[PDB]
């Protein structure tokens, strides 16, 4: 039972990047428990638009950490093939656990 | 307001304790108005800076526990 | 109410806890 966390600012290249990680584990391992979407940690910034004294009117900036999760029940190396380096994630991260 | 020391300045004490072997000087001028007036080292007169000058403050028993700044007021006509 | 340190309401408003509003 290999279980993996994936963070990302980019909601597209996760459901993308870490869901090829479901082909290369059903095609090369056995049973998968599909992609699970963890709720998001949304850091927000509120910024006064002008250099000087314009306290009403500012603009809203968010920085949104998306969180996806993957479970597979197959600690063999018929899997750990693609699933070590066979890349398409460029602004992503990995948590590796069992 | 603390209870683990009386956060009084080294540079001042050093100068009082070392005056405490026959020492009766007025010429004593500090800048640490932040330092607590400490149990019994009284008799003397300390010139406390108010930001513009030091002030001849005589120090008595009834007035321990208080800081030095309390006796050297910093602003004018009040 | 909200102005009185020594009420429940006082404490809530002020953020604090104490004798007049404990932490259970």
């Amino acid at each position: 039972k290999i279980r993996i966390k994936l963070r990302g600012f980019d909601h597209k290249t996760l459901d993308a990047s870490a869901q090829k990680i479901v082909e290369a584990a059903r095609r090369s391992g056995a049973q998968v428990s599909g992609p699970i979407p963890l709720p998001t940690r949304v850091r927000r910034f509120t910024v006064i638009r002008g250099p000087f004294k314009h306290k009403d009117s500012r603009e809203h900036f968010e920085l949104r950490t998306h969180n996806r999760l993957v479970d597979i029940i197959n600690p063999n190396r018929k899997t750990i093939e693609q699933l070590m380096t066979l890349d398409l994630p460029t602004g992503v991260e990995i948590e590796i656990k069992t | 307001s603390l209870k683990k020391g009386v956060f009084v300045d080294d540079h001042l004490l050093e100068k009082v304790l070392e005056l405490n072997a026959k020492g009766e000087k007025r010429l004593i001028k500090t800048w640490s108005r932040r330092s607590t007036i400490v149990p019994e080292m009284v008799g003397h007169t300390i010139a406390v800076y108010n930001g513009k000058q030091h002030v001849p403050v005589y120090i008595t028993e009834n007035m321990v526990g208080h800081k030095l700044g309390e006796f050297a007021p910093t602003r004018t006509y009040r | 109410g909200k102005g009185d340190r020594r009420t429940r309401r006082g404490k809530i408003w002020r953020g604090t806890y104490g004798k007049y509003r404990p932490r259970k």
């Binding site: 600012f9 910034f45 910024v47 006064i48 900036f61 968010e62 949104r64 | - | -």
Partner: protein, 60 residues
Amino acid sequence: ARKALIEKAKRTPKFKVRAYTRCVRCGRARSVYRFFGLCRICLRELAHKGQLPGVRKASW
């Protein structure tokens, strides 16, 4: 002064109380968002360029 100052804010000083922030570009004291070492202006600036990643136009 703002130089002898941009400089002084870099020395780890006697007592950490004296340790302040400073917009790392727009070399500046106030409204310094800690997650970016960035002054609210020199900040709205880079954000607009996309030179701070994931950072975006918020709207709800």
